[PDB]
Amino acid sequence: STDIQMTQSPSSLSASVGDRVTITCQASQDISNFLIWYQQKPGKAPKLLIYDASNLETGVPSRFSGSGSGTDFTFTISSLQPEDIATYYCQQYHNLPPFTFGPGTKLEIKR
Amino acid sequence: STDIQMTQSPSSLSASVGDRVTITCQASQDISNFLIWYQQKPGKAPKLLIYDASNLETGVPSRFSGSGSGTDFTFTISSLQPEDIATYYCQQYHNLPPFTFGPGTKLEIKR
Ligand SMILES: [Zn+2]
Ligand SMILES: [Zn+2]
Ligand SMILES: [Zn+2]
Ligand SMILES: [Zn+2]
Ligand SMILES: [Zn+2]
Ligand SMILES: [Zn+2]
Secondary structure, three states, X not given: OOOOOEXXXXXXXXXXXXXXXXXXXXXXXOOOOOEEEEXXXXXXXXXXXXXXXOXXXXXXXXXEEEEEOOOEEEEEXXXXXXXXXEEEEXXXXXXXXXXXXXXXXXXXXXX | OOOOOEEEEOOEEEEOOOOOEEEEEEEOOOXXXXXXXXXXXXXXXXXXXXXXXXEEOOOOOOOEEEEEOOOEEEEEEOOOOHHHOEEEEEEEOOOOOOOOEOOXXXXXXXX
16 A cells, blocks of 8 residues: 555653553554554664564563554553653554654653 | 664764755665665654655655665765754665664754
């Protein structure tokens, strides 16, 4: 398919350390499991956490996970840590460029 | 290949309006022409400018161009404009995830 739109919700949220947080990402058309999740902090490139929708990238903490296939996807942090403050993006790569990005979800955590 | 490292230079730069600006990207292994260039504005998702190394995305200003194939790539702004302030990333997609990002080039204008 072409002209695929990616959406994310919430656009921003605040939580507390130890909380379980789940954010969502939707593709306007089916993209199977070709969905990546990034974590981006200030002054750094997006960091790969999840690929193929649910595959945890090597080295990434196990408190991160993803699920979904088709159009609806989720990303979960099982127990928040202060360093998890970041913007989280989803990206589809079902076929060819563009590998459309979601608008991102900005997570804050109380200190 | 696997475990491909992407590098970028400069990591940041300041230039003047009208300047011709060239930034570079390297792949630790042969990625052919599977190389994308993004422009990321503060708080926003990365915007596609160039794909397949040298193909200018529809709507993207002509002052942007990309070249290179294999392991070295260049992104050029023929005439720097005030609206070009952003961080620029390259991304490889030669085969499977990770679609490795370069660490980015932060561009600012000296006015
Ligand atoms: Zn398609
Ligand atoms: Zn791997
Ligand atoms: Zn390979
Ligand atoms: Zn090859
Ligand atoms: Zn080659
Ligand atoms: Zn080289």
